[PDB]
Design a protein around this ligand. Structure first.
Ligand SMILES: [Zn+2]
Ligand SMILES: [Zn+2]
Ligand SMILES: [Zn+2]
Ligand SMILES: [Zn+2]
Ligand SMILES: [Zn+2]
Ligand SMILES: [Zn+2]
Ligand SMILES: [Zn+2]
Ligand SMILES: [Zn+2]
Ligand SMILES: [Zn+2]
Ligand SMILES: [Zn+2]
Ligand SMILES: [Zn+2]
Ligand SMILES: [Zn+2]
Ligand SMILES: [Zn+2]
Ligand SMILES: [Zn+2]
Length: 746
């Protein structure tokens, strides 16, 4: 019965043979401090005791990184704006964005940048914040959220962490789904919804580790579906399939949040290791032409196969399991029938984050949701699609009244009060937000004990057993797409010994240690590449990435160059008039406010410039084939297809070539490229070379299955339905279907 308490500022008081934390220092025990009451009473006691500014401070969530003092050499101390946020803005929600790792030899505090922090330093920092948060008048604790931390960067495989001090490395989201499908297939012969014991294994490690540093919240995971392969965010999606996606969100929510649901229907208890903020509701996947609504040319989400409801299925599974919070997306649902509405009705052509239809209607009224909504970061001011002319206060008001409870990237309470004083937001609405936002903190036990032992984080983050679990999923995520049968047998597994030529991110000594003489075809562009003739095997680690850093919306060379074509997207506004740039006939940069200059500001800045969040030049977003990407402006194939093609010809039989492809997006192995001529082709999703060599040499056999289908032609890419998985409705069809994957047979 008696909860474990820890108080660092306020004092512990006894009542009825029990201890409680006197958070408001009034000397006696308030209901909101009485852990014996149900949470609805503790919230009501607390909301009533709260000033309006304090209640408004709960509607703010912004970055609060750990810092280092350049004068003590101590890492993981409070940053500068910490005092402000907690004591002045009364914030209690932050995003923690330091890399947690063991710092290199010789790394000092630069006073600038975001320092890498150790597990014990990170927890010392979050503890420091909780101690400050406890010094507040009422003493409300803080909650930290963060983006994913346990996934390998398939672009930085050399520095994958194989030691303690860093979060255990697992494959990317899709690789986890690849492992779950392959583990189901291995056990049953079916590859449909997956074997979620994999997902629970991963999520159980992520939970212990995140919790051990006092990071009890997540911006994620992503429930978006990779139904549109030209979307650049497919690298953070688990699958294209809504059903597998739904089973994964369920398991994630159960594992990370717990299976004990409150009366309010939320998986929130003191054993809740990480409360999820699932994103991006009601599904961010079906982007028209794959263009992302971070950008003015990409505001549109279209549903040609009428799958709006499938895309939010994973969200309903997570809601039903009790997901704590939801973040909407900022794309615009184009001509989408209202769920549960009367015939002919469609959702407003406004960004989801501003539609009461979507965040109050669909989310809370049609689906079960009973938690709080967290907005996206950096969208209110510059990306309130369908509200171009509105002022910034009008936009914040729209999102708030539309159902958003806390504002991401916001750290000035004045904003909320200014809108309340301007009568665009009721104090009733504020109180509602405050009740939704305090509920998890009570239920998670942060009002009794919000601290962590930093010595224990050291022993937890990247423990040997956690890393082993990570490495298990790494090996199970590898999908073997092609394995030629030669006269002497199948290309994989490799024979013992031999001369190996490597191209791409490969750790030579790791490959060498499996018993191979290795030649390294990786040379600085000045130096000369050794030839691959006479190699017994060729290992190529390839991917594709965008170099669109040069895009500018209003330059007639790029964004406004008629030679680049027109934006086919059409979004008819509220009024019956097309949105600027989105009439179907406009130049690509035409939708950027720096062009149409709509809004209460005369000289706005380009919102799309540099394409900083990712994605190709919009006129190049369908170039997903490797021959096309080689020749494109904003696409780079790594290593160059020129070099890979030179190499596959220096070698006698292209059957000795083994391609390890990171399909960051569903890239197309076009016939012209010649890659299909490789003897073996694998889709990798983030693994160490130990994991890769373990499979390639036959210590373990491949068993992953594709969590999304791959096309063989660019036409299939243009024709597929942005909201529909696979390529079966296209004239060329799939190269490999969803759920495909070979294994060895001896
Ligand atoms: Zn009593
Ligand atoms: Zn009290
Ligand atoms: Zn406060
Ligand atoms: Zn189920
Ligand atoms: Zn202010
Ligand atoms: Zn101790
Ligand atoms: Zn453990
Ligand atoms: Zn060597
Ligand atoms: Zn030799
Ligand atoms: Zn051009
Ligand atoms: Zn051959
Ligand atoms: Zn060829
Ligand atoms: Zn054709
Ligand atoms: Zn599709």
């Amino acid at each position: 019965e008696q909860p474990e308490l820890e108080a660092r500022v306020k004092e512990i008081i006894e009542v009825d043979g029990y201890q409680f934390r006197d958070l408001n220092d009034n000397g006696e025990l308030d209901p909101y401090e009485d852990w014996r009451l149900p949470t609805p009473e503790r919230v009501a006691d607390l909301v009533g005791q709260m000033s309006l500014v304090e209640k408004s401070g709960l509607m703010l969530i912004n970055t609060l990184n750990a810092a280092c003092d350049p004068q003590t050499g101590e890492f993981g101390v409070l940053p500068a704006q910490a005092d402000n946020y907690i004591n002045t803005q009364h914030m209690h929600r932050f995003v923690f964005r330091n890399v947690v790792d063991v710092r290199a030899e010789g790394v000092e505090c630069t006073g600038t940048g975001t320092p890498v922090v150790s597990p014990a330093e990170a927890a010392t920092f979050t503890n420091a914040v909780q101690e400050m948060s406890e010094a507040t008048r009422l003493g409300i604790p803080s909650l930290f959220k963060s983006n994913a931390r346990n996934h390998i960067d398939p672009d930085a495989r050399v520095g994958i962490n194989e030691a303690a001090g860093a979060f255990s490395a697992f494959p990317k989201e899709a690789g986890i789904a690849a492992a779950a499908l392959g583990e189901q297939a291995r056990r049953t012969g079916e590859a449909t919804t997956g074997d979620m014991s994999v997902v629970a294994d991963f999520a159980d490690v992520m939970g212990e580790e995140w919790a051990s540093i006092g990071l009890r919240g997540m911006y994620g995971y992503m429930a978006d579906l990779s139904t549109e392969p030209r979307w650049y965010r497919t690298h953070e999606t688990f699958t294209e399939d809504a059903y597998l996606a739904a089973e994964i969100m369920e398991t994630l929510v159960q594992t990370l949040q717990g299976e004990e649901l409150t009366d309010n229907g939320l998986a929130l208890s003191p054993q809740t290791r990480v409360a999820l903020t699932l994103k991006h509701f009601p599904g961010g996947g079906p982007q028209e032409l794959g263009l992302d609504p971070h950008y003015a040319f990409g505001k549109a989400q279209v549903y040609p196969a009428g799958r709006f409801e499938e895309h939010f299925l994973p969200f309903q599974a997570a809601i039903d399991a009790g997901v704590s919070s939801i973040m909407p997306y900022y794309g615009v649902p184009v001509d989408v029938p209202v769920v549960g509405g009367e015939p002919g009705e469609t959702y407003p052509h406004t960004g989801f984050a501003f539609s009461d239809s979507i965040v109050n209607g669909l989310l809370r009224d049609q689906l079960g949701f009973t938690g709080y909504v967290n907005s996206n970061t950096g969208i209110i001011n510059d990306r309130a699609w369908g509200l171009e002319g509105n002022t910034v206060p009008e936009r914040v008001a729209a999102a708030i009244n539309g159902g958003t409870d806390t504002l991401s990237g916001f750290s000035d309470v004045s904003v909320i009060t200014d809108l309340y004083e301007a009568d665009l937001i009721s104090e009733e609405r504020i109180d509602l937000a405050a009740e939704r936002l305090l509920e998890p903190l009570f239920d998670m036990g942060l009002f009794e004990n919000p601290y962590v032992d930093p010595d224990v984080a050291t022993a937890t983050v990247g423990a040997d057993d956690h890393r082993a679990v990570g490495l298990d999923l790494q090996r199970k995520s590898l999908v073997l797409l092609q394995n030629e049968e030669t006269d002497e047998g199948p290309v994989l597994p490799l024979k013992e010994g031999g001369d190996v030529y490597i191209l791409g991110d490969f750790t030579e000594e790791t490959v060498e240690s499996y018993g191979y003489e290795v030649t390294n075809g990786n040379v600085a562009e000045g130096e000369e590449r050794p030839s691959a003739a006479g190699s017994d095997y060729v290992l190529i680690s390839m991917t594709a990435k965008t170099n669109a850093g040069d895009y500018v919306s209003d330059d007639p060379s790029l964004g406004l160059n008629p030679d680049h074509g027109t934006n086919p997207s059409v979004i008819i506004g509220d009024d019956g008039e097309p949105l600027p740039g989105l009439d179907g006939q406009s130049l690509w940069g035409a939708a950027d406010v720096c062009v149409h200059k709509e809004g209460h500001e005369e000289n706005p800045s380009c919102t799309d410039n540099r394409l900083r969040f990712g994605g190709a030049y919009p006129w190049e977003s369908s170039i997903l084939d490797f021959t096309g990407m080689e020749a494109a402006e904003s696409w780079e194939v790594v290593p160059s297809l020129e070099t890979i093609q030179e190499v596959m010809a220096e070698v006698e039989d292209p059957s000795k070539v083994i391609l390890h492809v990171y399909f960051r997006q569903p890239y197309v192995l076009d016939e012209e490229s010649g890659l299909r001529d490789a003897g073996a082709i694998l889709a990798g999703f983030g693994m160490t070379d130990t994991a890769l060599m373990d499979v390639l040499t036959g210590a373990y056999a491949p068993q992953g299955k594709l969590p999304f289908a791959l096309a063989g032609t660019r036409e299939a890419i243009i024709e597929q339905d942005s909201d529909r998985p696979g390529y079966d409705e296209t004239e060329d069809g799939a190269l490999y279907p969803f759920g495909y994957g070979l294994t060895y047979e001896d």
